[PDB]
């Protein structure tokens, strides 16, 4: 009836032309209004193969989130070893909005509703939709923010878990609030999180993790090395780049409920769209603040003989960030 195929998806968002948010401006030019009533047809007695790691929908969501950044967050000067660029650098309003990815005629999207699918393999309870759920293009590292949350229990997703060179996406199932603020070292900011809520998460997952290993103890430690983007929970909030220090989130002793993360606001950043540095104008005046929901984690397991298996926060290609939401989906040609 259908085959795995590739083509040109299209995006859909509930974006008003009234708004000045940069994300909205981009959507109004490249997305169509969300179909109001979506008709999804579960398919009885069917099983379909899925590989989140070979999914070309990601490749497209990548291109698009680059697109927004290209217009949404223009750097004053961006440096590569081929090219130097200096240009207009305005500050813009900035709030990520969900994005849906629909299929044109001749094609449809298949979704895996199994609450525990790892992302590579067949799926018993498969449905069919004309458009993904709405995914907020959050760019972040170590911690996955504002995503979807696992329906029932924690899910560990990797291509080859024995390969210590492959990202480990973790989809939590109980979110954890995080509040990051720069108030009005003077580019210093901070985040607050509930130790108890975070530790509870760290355990539910450290428990889930030994399930994939034989009678091995689990440990959490800070990153082994890398650019500040990797070695910190890095992100943008209000067009400002926070780099926050998760040494108090990745530890085998989890402190009091409220724990405080030192952050710093950077004008120079190593780019994820490309290999280079982008320089940005200093932070705007004001109380820049961002309450976020941690929905998943990115991690890496130390290799080499160990009696403990250690995991460390890992930034990765952003695509992984898209993978975390586009795991459930595939593209079929009728």
């Amino acid at each position: 009836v259908w085959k795995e195929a590739k083509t040109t998806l299209f995006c859909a968002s509930d974006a008003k032309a009234y708004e000045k948010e940069c994300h909205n401006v981009w959507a109004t030019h490249a997305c169509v209004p969300t179909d109001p009533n979506p008709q999804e047809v579960v398919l009885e007695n069917v099983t379909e193969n899925f590989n989140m790691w070979k999914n070309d929908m990601v490749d497209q969501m990548q291109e698009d989130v680059i697109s927004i950044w290209d217009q949404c967050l223009k750097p004053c000067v961006k440096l590569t070893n081929t090219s130097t660029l200096t240009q207009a650098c305005p500050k813009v309003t900035f709030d990520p909005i969900p994005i849906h990815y629909c299929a044109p005629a001749g094609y449809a999207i298949l979704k895996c509703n199994n609450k525990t699918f790892n992302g590579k393999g067949p799926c018993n309870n498969v449905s069919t939709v004309q458009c993904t759920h709405g995914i907020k293009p959050v760019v972040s590292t170590q911690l996955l923010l504002n995503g979807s949350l696992a329906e029932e229990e924690i899910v560990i997703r990797s291509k080859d878990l024995s390969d210590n060179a492959k990202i480990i996406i973790v989809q939590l199932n109980k979110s954890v609030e995080i509040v990051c603020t720069r108030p009005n070292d003077i580019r210093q900011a901070y985040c607050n999180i509930s130790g108890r809520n975070w530790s509870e998460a760290v355990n539910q997952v450290k428990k889930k993790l030994k399930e994939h290993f034989p009678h091995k103890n689990i440990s959490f430690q800070s990153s082994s090395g890398g650019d500040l983007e990797i070695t910190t929970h890095s992100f943008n909030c209000g067009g400002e780049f926070f780099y926050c220090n998760t040494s108090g989130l990745f530890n085998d002793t989890i402190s009091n409920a409220t724990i405080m993360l030192p952050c710093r606001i950077k004008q120079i950043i190593n780019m994820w769209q490309e290999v280079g540095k982008a320089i940005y104008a200093p932070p705007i005046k004001g109380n820049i603040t961002c309450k976020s929901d941690i929905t998943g984690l990115l991690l890496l397991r130390d290799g080499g003989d160990t009696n403990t298996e250690i995991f460390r926060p890992g930034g990765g290609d952003m695509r992984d960030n898209w993978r975390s939401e586009l795991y459930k989906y595939k593209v079929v040609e009728i």
Epitope: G225, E229, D305
Partner: antibody, heavy 125, light 104 residues
Framework: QVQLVQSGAEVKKPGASVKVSCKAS????????MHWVRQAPGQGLEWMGW????????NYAQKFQGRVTMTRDTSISTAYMELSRLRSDDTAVYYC??????????????????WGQGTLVTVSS | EIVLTQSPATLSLSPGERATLSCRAS??????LAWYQQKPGQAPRLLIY???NRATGIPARFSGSGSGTDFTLTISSLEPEDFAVYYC?????FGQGTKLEIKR
């Protein structure tokens, strides 16, 4: 004409640190992980870790943590390995090695198709 | 996390003979294995990648087989240049080596 070239043999005393260089040519340096592996005289191979040159991300073998540091300089296609607090039994030939496939291919990356010439060390009083 | 055992420790043959080398993975579930040849004072050379594919520049007399826990490297007819030490590798893990010798 893919080439990997390492710094020359170095001899250091016990308790010191060392930094070995590995200059790459013939490919996109950020496209491939560089691993490090050593070899004691007459002995087998012992993997030490890998680095991602696009990001600087690392993975280290548990056997040595805080005794070893891996780095990169993308401007000169050079990878570095630093091993601190040396023991006499760290005396060995050190090789850097590239996976066959580009990180973007996401396939099995641990086929070491390209090797450096090796760097001979000597931890000695 | 995984251990590689190759056997025998030493292989002694003559040119023209068939060579068979074994690598046994301990408790492993992967199907990926690479083979390396090393001559003294030289860098290792990748002979076979992904278990059963011949590396570029490697002669047709080399073959790989196996899946699972037991894997094999075959050389149809030993040539003078083929006697060396042989390693298997999976992920970050190396076997202890096999010495392939001229028997006399």
């Amino acid at each position: 004409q893919v080439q990997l070239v390492q710094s020359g043999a170095e001899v250091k005393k016990p308790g010191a640190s060392v930094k070995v260089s590995c200059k790459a040519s013939g490919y996109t340096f950020t496209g491939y992980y560089m691993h490090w592996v050593r070899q004691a005289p007459g002995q087998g191979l012992e993997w030490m870790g890998w680095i991602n040159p696009n990001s600087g991300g690392t993975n280290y073998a548990q056997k040595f943590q805080g005794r070893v540091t891996m780095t990169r300089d993308t401007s000169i296609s050079t990878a570095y390995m630093e091993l601190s607090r040396l023991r006499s039994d760290d005396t060995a030939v050190y090789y850097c090695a590239r996976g066959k496939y580009c990180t973007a291919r996401d396939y099995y990356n641990w086929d070491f198709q390209h090797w450096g010439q090796g760097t001979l060390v000597t931890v000695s009083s | 996390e995984i251990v590689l055992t190759q056997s025998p420790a030493t292989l002694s043959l003559s040119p023209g003979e068939r060579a068979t080398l074994s690598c046994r993975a301990s408790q492993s579930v992967s199907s990926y294995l690479a083979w390396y040849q090393q001559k003294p004072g030289q860098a290792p050379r990748l002979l076979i990648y992904d278990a059963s594919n011949r590396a570029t520049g490697i002669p047709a007399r080399f073959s790989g087989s196996g899946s699972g826990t037991d894997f094999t490297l075959t050389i149809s007819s030993l040539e003078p240049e083929d006697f060396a030490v042989y390693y298997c590798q999976q992920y970050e893990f190396f076997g202890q080596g096999t010495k392939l010798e001229i028997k006399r």
